[model samples]
Target: QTAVTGGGASLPADLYKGSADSILPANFSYAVTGSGTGKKAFLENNSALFSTTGTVHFAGSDSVLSSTELNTYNSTYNVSGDANRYGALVQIPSVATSVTIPFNKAGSAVDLSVTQICGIFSGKINNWSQLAGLGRTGAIQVVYRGESSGTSELLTRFLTSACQPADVSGTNLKLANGVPAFSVQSTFANLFTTVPSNFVAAPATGGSALYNAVYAVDGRVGYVGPDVIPSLTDATKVAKVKSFSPDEVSVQATLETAAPPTGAAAENPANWVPVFGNPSAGYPIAGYTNFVFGQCYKNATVGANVRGFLTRHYGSTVVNGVEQGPNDDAIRAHKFIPLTKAWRDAVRARFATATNAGAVNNPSTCSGIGRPL
Candidate 1:
């Protein structure tokens, strides 16, 4: 048995779990560690930060690998000109999701406009009364994840695109680093010059923690995920931004809008980008649970294993007269959406066959201009 070891991104932990349990290669196992640890596991090959420890064969993330991450890997491994030993780093987005706006309001339903969402999150609208629907009055405490968060990343992607200088407070107009904000990025807190006084970051780390913190405080609002909604209390209700609810259809169109165009560019891992901000149409704040794999593998069995897994993940494949694939029930039940057929077809072809390093598989054949294993 291969025992392929992999894991990442707590945001879509269930989807991975569900598929691994029922459909993936018999010897595969995964961890539910957050995105930061997940990427590190793949980069280093060993993972102590992971909930379960082992050499990682693949990684999952909510955001694309930043330029800094790629540059660092290139320098550390001296991967600049090496192709045969290390292959390519590939990031493929398969599962789409929306960053949910969960609140502590109990009595009435809340629907916030995009402008109002920016104001509330930026701390410009710091009270419930300032938000019309809730007749109740209390300071609108904002809860934020202090740790590296993909949930925060997706939320900010929309904010960076949609938020205006006037929508944010004067002091909050720039990033924490003092640069003018509104640029798409891998981190969310950088969008604030100073975290609003009413804005709270505790031990807040990921979506689960953010949701719990918001749940504890009667008037708190925070960005969270849809996967955990099944267990929420009556005190916790999600807000719809504009007409967009965090539903499968809402986020599917948003993710497809960011899918690579077609043909050769679609085959290049570097060409894949995030939903630049929010889509001009569809749900405003959504993102993908992208998977990371080395373009080439140290062992051909592992190389074939990676290809086999993604083939099913991108679409269906038959093995031993059995249909092998990402489990659809787990996807819909957990509120995640499948990749668009266009992107899936692109991804399916990416790992199938490649003439150079830009493709995925064994390092010897797939070597060149890609993340080396």
Candidate 2:
């Protein structure tokens, strides 16, 4: 009954929905819209980007709010007397996952080194025939999320780090679009100096649509969430990165190595990407999926319900002065790494907005109330 709902970040959408089904009350829903749309709803409750879902109480984003967004909220949405003000923001990392390469080509098992993967995505290696040792022959078709996507942002982060100037060859290492550097951006296509002839976009918002676009065409390879790999009608469809032993294990296990945030970095989302974007070891590309909420809410019931939903999702509770964690096999079953005891505890203890409203008396961390801040 309270109709608790949120949506964004198609990369982690499956796990979010699955966890909701297992832990939440009836009528809970999460839209599979892209992260941009989710952020839009969070900024302006009835953003035109969404028509199906009611005002989203929380938005699941693989990327956190940017400085521009924070500035906009403070100036326009969070003004003291504005009806649009939501509240102070609460952003916390919920889980960690990788940007999986989904490609459709019926044949031998394919493994790509980081160099090869970069060449393919950066528009340098346009034809599959260019990569030697692979038995496939055809022009490489690139598929990316056309809309604003945290998958794109996270993928870009990995690329910006993994595919540096020296990684790809020439000293003039530049992006396909003639841009000198690759920055973290939600729109993947903008990275290209010009849209390559071989490039194709999903023409829709959600990851499911993007996955379908990949499957519909041959020699089409695109990036999406790890959760899409196993349940595929064809199981061995994902592209493994590098000669790393246990590549599959390497990718999923990599997320486990992510250190939980602490201290000031724990609360400031602007600092999270710099700190949490890169893990020390394992798969080369991975990022944490985050939840964004208002620090306070005008509606006590809404605030309490939002926090309740988060509590169930976190699956953490203290018993006898000790912390306990949920059985995350289900989450791992979908190829995601749920936050560990330390990570979950950090979120529970650090975020005032996410805490029980009555218990904290709505701490001074954020002054704006939910729906706008």
Candidate 3:
């Protein structure tokens, strides 16, 4: 049987590794790539059988996908049709990596509340000195995403969720005060936007470049996934800006909060942090990478292959040294909080009913203002 092909964000890599390393047939093959065009193209060309996205907010913007394209897709595929042809999206709460805040101040690391961070980005807070009392006085430079990026969507949605109903400046549009906006991908090569001349706020593409750029700049902040933490220089210096850092205990605790049924509601900063010590916690801003698949396959052969792949992916078996087993390692490696065993079991029970099942979608569903399922 021809192996089902899939494409999406970083999570696919983990899923692929899990499948190939363990119970999945050795011949099983899948492709992975960064989010955005690769995913859109794969969907359009039908070259890919399944795809993932960071957020479902794509439903909001016409720029992301034309209404025509969306309608065409619904017509051609059963994804939005009756029975919701797409598989039941399963979401796991993977805490997003911290967005390092690079600042011009030169003393100790700065501490800005999530509201302050939102202000800086949204144009509410205009200067660095206003933030962390670091004694350095300079205008706060803003950087953002330029590429068609899932990270951009994640960051924007998160900021909006965290500092909602407030005016926050992003995109290329500067704050009402006319602070210059820099739109650059989060790669290190693009990290050097100095005061009074240039600013960098582009979509983050390459992780290493972003790490180098954020570190190289005296005061710079950018967001990345958790696994990339070790790759950053002086990872500690990078700052634990997220709801939680990478301690095994913190992760384990966060996982307990992500149990199914209730979903990941407890992990929201307002809910989880007060109980734990996550000061940065509020509404969970992390993005869940998901796989989109057709529920009612026009071709039964393709459907069978897709189902088989899902079974192997969700099965309990360790492929390679990596734990692809039905165990929780995949969720853990992504630094996503895992569901409780009971909740996990409940999810499995639901998975049994899915026409096409894949990894969870949209972490935002676990946020305080979670999207309706």
Candidate 4:
């Protein structure tokens, strides 16, 4: 049986259950552990169950590994002297999602400018009344994820750049490490000293917990992926963030703009850049969901099964002019953006030569194969 472990982003635990039921053999299983735990398990060569002998086929992560982590992976696993093995630790970005600031402000549309959001998160603005033109006087309850999470990382990158002293229009900006900041401190346990007096720490382990916490508390504000919380109701409002410069539009407007052209360039690893620091277009809080895989596997059957399963979902395999990838529906049903043709082609190229022992042909042959229309 092939087992995959990693980020619960997109609720893969439930999504993959359908994939295993149809596209993959019944032997396949996926665990929805957080990205940090999945990466650690992959690096340690341990399975989600912590079995030393069981191998994790891949790790799912919402963010790419740090440079140091990639280097360590290359040194440890990419030692095979083959053309395909060089820097064989690969990251395949399959989809994109955004972080939303959800709050329990009923019957009112809260349009938060970047400056205002920074102030609220940084503890400079303590109540609804403090917001310009909003007359409500309820104390602002700041709720934050209390774990090392990819969502938090993305939010931090956005908040850090958006709240930079130079960009903020307000005074008394809360600073972290001497920079305008919000969210948790350097670690999860240490709340940002700037956080409001009415602070609540939600478990960082999963999106549902954070969503539930925010949902249960009136006047509470927190960040979470819109799709992650399946039960969001009209009671909770998602605030729109102002774009940076020139456009000065909201994040919702950016998402409404037509998607950019996609091709081989979009697939290039070099082009897989993080969305951070004042993006001029698209949703400012967007990030790629990635699948991390080693270049080769020790068992041929296992390797073939893994490739076949991933290709069925990530690659466009058409038959008789009709696409036949069985897992595509699951991806979309889960609200994930499908990888473009070029992106999938490039991914296939990287894994084309992956094998159990050496430079043998991949039985799956999904990679490096002609693109299926």
Per-residue CA lDDT of candidate 4, range 34-97, in tens? 5666666666567743333466656666645776776676666554453333224446665555
Error of 4 at 66 (Å): 0.3
lDDT of each: 0.68, 0.67, 0.40, 0.55
- The numbered model that scores best in TM-score is 1
Give the per-residue lDDT digits (tens) of candidate 1, residues 36-95.
777888877675666555456788788677777877765664354554345457777767
Candidates 1 and 4: which is better by lDDT? 1
lDDT of 2 at 152: 89
**Which prediction has more favorable TM-score, 1 or 4?**
1
Model 2 gets an lDDT of: 0.67
lDDT of 3: 0.40
- TM-scores of all candidate predictions against the true structure: 0.83, 0.83, 0.56, 0.73
Scored by lDDT, the top model is: 1
RMSD of each: 4.4, 4.3, 10.2, 6.9
Once fitted onto the true fold, the runs of candidate 4 whose alpha carbons sit more than 4 angstroms away are 1-13, 18-26, 48-53, 79-87, 166-178, 181-197, 230-236, 243-277, 317-329, 352-373
lDDT accuracy of residue 109 in candidate 3? 48
Per residue, candidate 2 scores C-alpha lDDT tens digits across 1-373 of: 4565577777777766665434334555677788988888777665345455556667888867888887887787557776555555777776667677888877777778777887887777877788777778888898988888988888888777767554454322345555455567788877765767788989787787888899898999988887776542332477766643222334334544555566666555555433234444555677777877766666566666766655656667666786655636556766776667766665555553344332212644333445522
Better of 3 and 4 by lDDT: 4
For model 4, give the 10-residue run with minimal summed lDDT: 364-373
